[PDB]
Amino acid sequence: IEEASFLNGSDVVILIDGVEELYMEEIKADFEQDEQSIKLLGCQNEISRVGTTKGSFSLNGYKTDSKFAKLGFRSFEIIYNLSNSETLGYESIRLKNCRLKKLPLINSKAGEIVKIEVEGSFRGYDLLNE
Amino acid sequence: IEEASFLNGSDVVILIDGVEELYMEEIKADFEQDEQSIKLLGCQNEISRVGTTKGSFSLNGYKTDSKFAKLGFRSFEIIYNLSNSETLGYESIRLKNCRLKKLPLINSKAGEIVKIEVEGSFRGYDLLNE
Amino acid sequence: IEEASFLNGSDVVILIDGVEELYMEEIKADFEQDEQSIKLLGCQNEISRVGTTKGSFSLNGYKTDSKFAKLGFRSFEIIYNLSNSETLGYESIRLKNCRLKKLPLINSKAGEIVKIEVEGSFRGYDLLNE
Amino acid sequence: IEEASFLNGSDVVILIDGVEELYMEEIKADFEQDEQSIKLLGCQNEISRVGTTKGSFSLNGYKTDSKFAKLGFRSFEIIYNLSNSETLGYESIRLKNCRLKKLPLINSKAGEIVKIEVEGSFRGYDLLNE
Amino acid sequence: IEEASFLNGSDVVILIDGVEELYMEEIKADFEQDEQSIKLLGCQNEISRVGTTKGSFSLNGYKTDSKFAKLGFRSFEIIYNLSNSETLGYESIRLKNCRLKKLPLINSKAGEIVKIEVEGSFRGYDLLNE
Amino acid sequence: IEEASFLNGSDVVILIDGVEELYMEEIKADFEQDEQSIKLLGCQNEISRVGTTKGSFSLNGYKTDSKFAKLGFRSFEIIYNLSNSETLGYESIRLKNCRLKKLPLINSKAGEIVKIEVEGSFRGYDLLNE
Amino acid sequence: IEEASFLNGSDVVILIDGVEELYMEEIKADFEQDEQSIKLLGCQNEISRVGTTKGSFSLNGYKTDSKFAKLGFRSFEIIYNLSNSETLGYESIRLKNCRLKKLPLINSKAGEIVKIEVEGSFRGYDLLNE
Amino acid sequence: IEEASFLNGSDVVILIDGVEELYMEEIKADFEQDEQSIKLLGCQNEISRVGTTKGSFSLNGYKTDSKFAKLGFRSFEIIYNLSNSETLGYESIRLKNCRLKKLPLINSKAGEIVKIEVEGSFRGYDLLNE
Amino acid sequence: IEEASFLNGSDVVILIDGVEELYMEEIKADFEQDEQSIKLLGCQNEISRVGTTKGSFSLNGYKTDSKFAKLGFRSFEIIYNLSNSETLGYESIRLKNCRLKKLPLINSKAGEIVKIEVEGSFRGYDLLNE
Amino acid sequence: IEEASFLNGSDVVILIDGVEELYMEEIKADFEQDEQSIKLLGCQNEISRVGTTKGSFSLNGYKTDSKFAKLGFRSFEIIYNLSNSETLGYESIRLKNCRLKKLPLINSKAGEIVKIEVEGSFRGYDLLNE
Amino acid sequence: IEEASFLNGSDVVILIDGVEELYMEEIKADFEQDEQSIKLLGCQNEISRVGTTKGSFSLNGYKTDSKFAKLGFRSFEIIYNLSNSETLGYESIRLKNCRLKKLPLINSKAGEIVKIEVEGSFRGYDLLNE
Amino acid sequence: IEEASFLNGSDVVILIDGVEELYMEEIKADFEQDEQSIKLLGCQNEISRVGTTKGSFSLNGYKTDSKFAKLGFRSFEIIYNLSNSETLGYESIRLKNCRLKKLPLINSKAGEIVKIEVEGSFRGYDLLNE
């Protein structure tokens, strides 16, 4: 019903190691189970339990510097804020111990704008606001 | 033949842990066998038997809050009601011990509406109505 | 050459456990070998032999009831009749000991008609008519 | 250069067990190596040798009878003739000991013409003409 | 060369103490030498001679009764018939004084079909047919 | 032939010292001969005779208490019931004087569910039902 | 039935000589019989009796110090606590007079994290809690 | 910059076993490493070394004869010449010990021109011109 | 915000072994972890650590010479410069010990411009400028 | 270098007691030393001398008759010929006084082709051709 | 918890007889008890005591010289240093009187990098640093 | 560090009794101690001393002749040369008094290339070059 509840991608600000990142196209982050399946002798359905949690992120954008190449495989943090405009509420998520799986050293095509895409893993998250 | 028997997606109401969810785009739920294949010496076709049953659900929608991030990996229930309008009949399905496989912490694109997609597993189901 | 030999999907009637199913979109059924490959020392080509036979079916349609959810994983039969109109001939195939691999508990999208898709296995077949 | 050398699909006649098949859409047949790779200590490139040969065919068409369902998994032959019209030359290939991998018992969609698709294996081939 | 000479496991019927066993998965039987090695002073290769013969069988299947638990360690016979279908020939082997080495009292896993596996010894064999 | 004769692991209930055990994954029990081999001077095959009988069991499951650690090396009984559902028949086996070979004091891995596995010996068995 | 009864490896804390060990991957401990087999003249089954008890442990983890190399072959204790979260119950086991069979002086591979694995024996155990 | 440096597919002539092939649509040939990855204890990046070299080719065209069916799995050579027109330079590559992986016995569709596609392996190459 | 920060593919110059490459369509280079996953007994999330680093590049272009065929599998370097025009800044990346995984001997289609595509691995990188 | 020197398994013909065996999958034969180790007082390396020679063979194939069951433990001969096709040379080896260690009375699985595997010993060998 | 405590294999430097070894893949070293088991008349558990200590090492790497073949069976020392990078701490272990059990004279495969693997024994160890 | 130090299997040439062997896949040779363990009354660690040295080799390849069958159990020599290409250095090892443990008379499988594998012992070695 309420039009105002929907949140657009334009209400997004990303901070990589405390400095705002402006030239990003999309971002993803998931906190995934290693779900443990259990089968019992007296019971005829599988029982699922929570396993170890791992974080995975991807982060696609437009290249304007060699920030990620300098950044290397050092650990960093990602603070992601998604705000509402019609309402004043906002969500803020801090991904901790983020680390790149691979360095986007070179990615260019003949007549397109140079884009940068990275992926990696993070240990845990803090839901700062909501 | 009968036009009235068909059921549209618009006749759908979803309850996550007893509170209605309004900003959902699609939902899926399957109760899958671990079917056991049997081959016998005197017989020339495979015999299939029912194994342990597992439930899997997926649930795609539009982000309006951090409900699933707060929800974490705790167990919850999903009550799914699909009603007919031309007829007064309706189906109601309760998925029990539902648990998320991964947390949709961040999912945003440059100029699109922020969407949320989750998947998980459930133990069993109750066919409340039909 | 002969236009009349072709058979359209519209000349199809499906019986699930003896009661006609009217709201189906497509149906598939295959009877597959576990073909055994043989290599011999004196011979330079593989010899293939018939192994155990397994049946697999899929059955896509439009949801009008909770028939398959009630049906569960019980064994049922499928009688498939494909008739000719310009000619009076018809084929009838009976799939025996049919059993669902998974239950289509929930499948709905935002603005589409609710569809139901199931798959399973069957032991053998009877070619009743042809 | 020469327009006449090209061969169209329309110049095709297929014989299944000696009786012509008229309602076929496409046909495939390959005679595949189990190629053996050899690495030697003194040499820096792989040596390839001929292994056992296996035949595989596929055969898609339009359903007009239960020929393949009756045919079951019995061995049969396929004689494939591809003729030239502008020239009088023609090729004829006989696939021997052909055997179906699976039976196309049922394949129908809501408003489409009923099609039949089969696949299988054959032992060897005779290049009757060319 | 001849496809018909090969014998499939599906052409197998097993009789335990004169009553047919239908739920068996595989069977083995060997008649083993206690081969005697001889070394001679004037000769530079070992001479091998036939020693006492012992029979050993194994018999894996699916549990449908407590037949083997009741059977205990009593002596029984196994008649094994392997028939050809394309040809009318068949082999029949009678294992005599068969006796179980161990009783399969309990063998069950969480979500699998209950299987039974036994092993034992037999004195001699009669090649009834061939 | 008969689908109903097969018995699944889900139809299993285990009683350790008269109290039901619910969190078990698999169970095994064998009653093994100390088979005596006999060679005779006039005869050219080995004669096998029944020796002393020993029982061995293994019992794998999921840890929910320190039941087996408290149980120590005291003697206990195991009653194993395997029931049929499609048929009403059932088997019941009582293992007597069961005793653990080793105590599963500690068994845990980094991110897996804590499992418990025990093995032991039993004197004799009673086939209560069948 | 009860989801809460299962215990995950994540609810584990290990104390080596009173100081907590944080970088462990898995732990094992068994208290094994030297079971004595008895055969009697009038009786046709083996009688089993409890022999001397020995403890054996293994302890795999990630190397962060030379703790075990300094520890040498001195006697130490292991206190193992496995707690429940959904329930407040917990088990605590104290292994006494633990002693290493071998010292893990060096264990490293080319591109993997340095792991440490030890095994040893203990005299007895105290089941502190449960 | 220079328009003349580009080479079109039209400047291509292919020789199969010394006789020109005119009805080809595309050709591919690669000489692939079995690259050996090395990880060292003192070093934090992988070292790559050249392994055994294998050649793979594919060759798609239009069917005008049974050349490849007669050719079988015999070894043959492929000489590939790519010429420049605006410049007089040209490249010539000779693939040696070329051998088909599979025979394109039959490939025809309902109303399309009969095409032939083959793949195979070659030992080495000679860069005759450039 | 700033239009000038974006970098187009047209501001790219590539040097293969010190000589400029003009007829390239796109280039890629990544420096990938062999990320090591760690699970601990007391902790409920995976710990990720940096493993050995490997470089992978791909390099697609238009064929104007047999440079890569002559180059073979020898080691070479790639210097990649991406310059800004509105700003005077530029990035320069030197890939070291670059080596081809496969040689693009032949790649041509019927009526298209002859293209060349290569892939390979490199040991490390130097970020010369930025 | 020379492709023609390699010998495939397809160029194999086996004669058991003078009659060709066609349904064999693999064959092995070794002539093994009972090597005598010598240590001397003045010398610091072991001296090895030739002991008595024994032959061992294994012979795996597909069952088409009860040939080996009738053959029993009687002595027989094996003539093994391995021919070259590209060259006209061939090897022929005659194993003498071959005798089975065990009789393959029964070997069948649920849905697989019945295979026969035998092993035994032979006294000596004649290298008839080469 | 602490990411920095983990030690990677890349922080490893090995000295064989005082000269650094760079081309090693993995190393192992254990200092093993000849543990003495004691059983007493009044006591019902085994008593374990420390026996003589023996050292065993293994050392796998890549061959670049005949160092170990020249080294023969002479006694040598191994100094193993494992350093931390995020922290400045390091461990150093000196294995004394190391001696090879066997000489890796030849170890090569068809298309793989030549590797060298050795094993041996050492008398004692000095924990130089930690 | 240095790429050139690594030695590939392709830089290998083997001489059996002075004539080069070209069709070999891998080779092994070890010179093993009969290490003598010493325990002393006043000392708490084992003392290890060099015992008699024995050589063992294995040599796997592809069959192209009956060289090893003719060779029998006669003594022969193996000269193994492993060369560097980027550097001009090379290793040469001469194994003396090599003698086969068993003769590879027959080794063939259904559709694989005939391989030959031998093992044996040698007295001593000469490190000719390095």
Numbering used by the authors:
A (entry chain h), B (entry chain i), C (entry chain j), D (entry chain e), E (entry chain X), F (entry chain W), ...: 7 to 136
What does the publication say?
Each ring is offset from those above and below such that the extended tail assembly can be described as a six-stranded helix, with a twist of 19°, a rise of 39 Å, and an outer diameter of 230 Å. However, a notable feature is that the tail is considerably longer (225 nm) than those of other phages whose structures have been described. In the extended state (left), the sheath forms extensive interactions between the sheath and the tail tube. The main tail tube protein, gp56, has the conserved fold seen in other Caudoviricetes tail tubes. However, gp56 lacks both the ɑ-loop and the N-loop seen in other myovirus tail tube proteins, as well as the C-terminal loops seen in siphovirus tail tube proteins. The gp55 tail sheath protein is made up of three domains. The tail tube–proximal domain I contains a loop consisting of residues 368–378, which is twice as long in φCD508 than in the sheath domains of pyocins, AFP, and PVC (six residues and three residues, respectively). Domains I and II reside in strong density, but domain III lacks density because of flexibility in the region.
Here, we reveal the extended and contracted atomic structures of an intact contractile-tailed phage (φCD508) that binds to and penetrates the protective S-layer of the Gram-positive human pathogen Clostridioides difficile. The virion can be divided into five distinct regions: the head, neck, tail, baseplate, and needle. Structures of purified φCD508 virions in both extended and contracted conformations were determined by single-particle EM of frozen-hydrated samples; the resolution ranged from 2.6 to 4.0 Å for the extended phage, and 2.9 to 4.2 Å for the contracted form.
